[PDB]
Structures are given as C-alpha cells and as structure tokens.
C-alpha cells in the first residue's frame, strides 16, 4: 500500500576552523504487505466448519550511518543488527 519513507539530516558549521559538513539519509522505511501475505484457513470436514483469515502487516526497516540496522513487524518486535553482519560458526 503506501510505504512511508522517512529521512534524517545533519548540518554543521564550524566558524572557528572554517569547516562545514552535512548529511542526508534514508533512515526509516515503512511498508504495507498485502493481506494474502499472512493468512490461515482451516477445514473441519468432520463438523463441516471452515474458517479463513487474512491480514496486512506493516514492516519496518531502519538504517544508520553508524552501521546499525533495525527491522521488524510494526506492532511486534524489532531486531537490531551490527553491520557488516558478522555471522557465527
């Protein structure tokens, strides 16, 4: 549906040392997943009862300059990663 794209900026002026610095980045991204995306149907052929459900979920991806990512399902959990991802085995 309507992904939302949220940004962050920093802008800095040093007058003492005559230095300037700025930064714009895609910080948080929010999207909608179709209802078919997560569904359940159950058929009870003994009792002749059927049930169906489908529901949207909104997913969250957040990133940063200091290489930390954050993602998950809006309304449930977030998970945080330290980039570059450093597997264990």
């Amino acid at each position: 549906m309507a992904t939302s794209e949220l940004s962050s900026e920093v802008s800095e002026e040093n007058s003492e040392r005559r230095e300037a610095f700025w930064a714009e980045w895609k910080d948080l991204t929010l999207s909608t997943r179709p209802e078919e995306g997560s569904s359940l149907h159950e058929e009870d052929t003994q009792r002749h009862e059927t049930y169906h459900q489908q529901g949207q979920s909104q997913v969250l991806v957040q990133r940063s300059p200091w290489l930390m990512m954050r993602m998950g399902i809006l309304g449930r959990g977030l998970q945080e990663y330290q980039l570059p991802y450093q597997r264990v085995l």
Partner: peptide, 8 residues
C-alpha cells in the same frame, strides 16, 4: 541510501 559532505 544517503549522501554526506565534508569541507575544509
């Protein structure tokens, strides 16, 4: 996913 600028 972003840009940054440093001046001296």
């Amino acid at each position: 996913v972003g840009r940054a600028t440093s001046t001296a």
